[PDB]
């Protein structure tokens, strides 16, 4: 049908052919029985007093055949209204959503995560009070304080560990590498599972909303990250090999091969500058200014991207 | 002909003097025979069902006579495709494209890039393991494992070297310094030729789109990477001079000369700190703390621009 269509919203004037609305039989403007209340019979037009920049969007998805965007100078939240009232169906409001991005439960049920913080914020405090000097074969490998309040937690964890996902295995691992060691030779394994007992620092983020946006933030980066240190690894192996054979000749390089070098070049390139190794010659200050300037350049590239997928992941949760 | 022409699409009516269109008889609109087709007797105006945003430019394209730039409200993607249905011609398309700025072949010549990347991730390596202490006239100068599995992949090499262009001179001077030195005095020149060794580290750019990404954000950066190292060399010999003469009566001035302070002046501009040199004196304290600040400026200049330069680029190619 060339029959064509006249919309008029708010005053400006819409037209278009009734077999470009026949496409979505289903929605407001493709029902006849749906519109057929809108019409103006005196202007042969349907008019509707709404909102007048969302419109123009409205037509082109059926025009185009399906593309749903939004323009740029109309809020999202008018926008939506708009597909709602229109009613362009599910299946289009979902595929617009995409290309557009239990503790407190009522108080009662929300304090028992306080009882899990502490049971961390502490569990943490307590992980590194061992470490200490003024605290230190059943002795060589290993009742004692550091294993009294530290279990007086351990079964408190593998408690709501019953009571799968990420957060969830947040808590497997929190308490894994302890009934691993328990497990023999009654007279460097198992050192692996002492330091993995860190991990339950990242008990913290099923209370830190701020944490687990980054964490996103993150495998929503994964392209960037990976750049940023292929990138470094180039800078470092190339400026290790220059400040090497620059240096080669010397009654005090500081280097005493290229993979040595490498520790400079990171430090040097991410500006730390330790000191616990430096160029004495003038090839190798050259090299090292260079190495300077490259790094923070190198780093620079990659980081921008990833500081706006926080900008955004940030804000959207809030 | 004044004979003047009224356009109405999807309802937004435009109008020009048909002479306008006359100026391009090759177009949509410029065709009689071809625009005879959208023409609505009943209205004397030619009528389109298509996208409204984007017409407003295809007509000034006529009246400006050629200037067909992109409405900032409209997709790259939408906007092309008018571009191509009102058939503005190619050079048009082209200069609009302007303005807007074999491994993987099918698996089998595709796998057959893993086998350069070793050849390469390995060949790096090697490389470095060489200036390893634990590893080190025949001998002055000069079989051997370093020499062993570095030719196993020498011809490997000068095998696909024959299986002109930037991306191919990767693996020429990826073997050249080779063979130079192979070719003499049977009993410091040769040595300008095992540091070009480490370019091999390029050959990577074949496979890392990251990397050759980086590749045109510098040449189409140039002039940034200028400005920022004629600044620098600019507060480098304004400040070492500085610090200098405010540590020249000094018992333990470190600054034995300005030439000297370079160093010193680079290493604060860039905010590494190694402490290899550092004032000692008030005048000289006062100075270096400038440079700081002076250092942080300077940098945080061209840079930015560079930042963008790769923003876009990252993402063109993506
Ligand atoms: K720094
Ligand atoms: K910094
Ligand atoms: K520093
Ligand atoms: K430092
Ligand atoms: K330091």
Redesign the interface.
């Known amino acids: 049908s060339s029959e064509?269509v006249?919309?008029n919203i708010s005053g400006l004037?819409?037209?278009?052919?009734l077999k470009?609305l026949a496409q979505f039989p289903e929605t407001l403007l493709g029902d006849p029985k749906k519109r057929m209340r809108y019409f103006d019979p005196l202007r042969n037009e349907y008019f509707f007093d709404r909102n007048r920049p969302s419109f123009?969007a409205i037509?082109?998805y059926y025009?185009?055949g399906g593309?749903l965007?939004r323009?740029?100078?109309v809020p999202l939240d008018i926008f939506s209204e708009e597909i709602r009232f229109y009613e362009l169906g599910e299946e289009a409001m979902e595929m617009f959503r995409e290309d557009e991005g239990y503790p407190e439960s009522s108080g009662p049920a929300r304090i028992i995560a306080i009882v899990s913080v502490m049971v961390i914020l502490i569990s943490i405090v307590s992980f590194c009070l061992e470490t200490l000097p003024i605290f230190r074969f059943h002795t060589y490998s290993q009742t004692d304080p550091f294993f009294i309040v530290e279990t007086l937690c351990i079964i408190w964890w593998s408690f709501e560990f019953l009571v799968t996902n990420i957060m969830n295995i947040i808590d497997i691992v929190a308490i894994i590498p302890y009934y691993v060691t328990i497990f023999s030779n009654k007279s460097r394994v198992v050192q692996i599972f002492r330091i993995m007992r860190i991990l339950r620092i990242f008990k913290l983020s099923r209370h830190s909303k701020g944490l687990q946006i980054l964490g996103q933030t993150l495998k929503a980066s994964m392209?960037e990250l990976?750049?940023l240190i292929?990138?470094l690894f180039?800078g470092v192996?190339?400026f290790?090999?220059?400040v090497?054979?620059a240096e080669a000749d010397e009654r005090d390089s500081q280097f005493?091969?290229?993979?040595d070098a490498f520790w400079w070049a990171v430090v040097?390139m991410t500006?730390?500058?330790?000191?616990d190794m430096?160029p004495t010659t003038i090839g190798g200050?050259i090299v090292?200014?260079l190495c300077?300037?490259a790094?923070?350049?190198t780093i620079?590239?990659p980081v921008?991207?990833i500081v706006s997928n926080f900008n955004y992941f940030y804000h959207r949760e809030t």
Chains 1, 2 share one sequence.
């Open positions: 064509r006249v919309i004037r819409f037209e278009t052919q470009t123009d037509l082109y025009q185009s593309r965007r323009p740029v100078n392209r990976g750049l292929f990138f180039i192996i190339l290790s090999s220059a090497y054979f005493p091969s290229i993979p040097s500006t730390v500058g330790y000191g430096v200050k090292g200014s300077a300037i790094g923070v350049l620079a590239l921008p991207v």
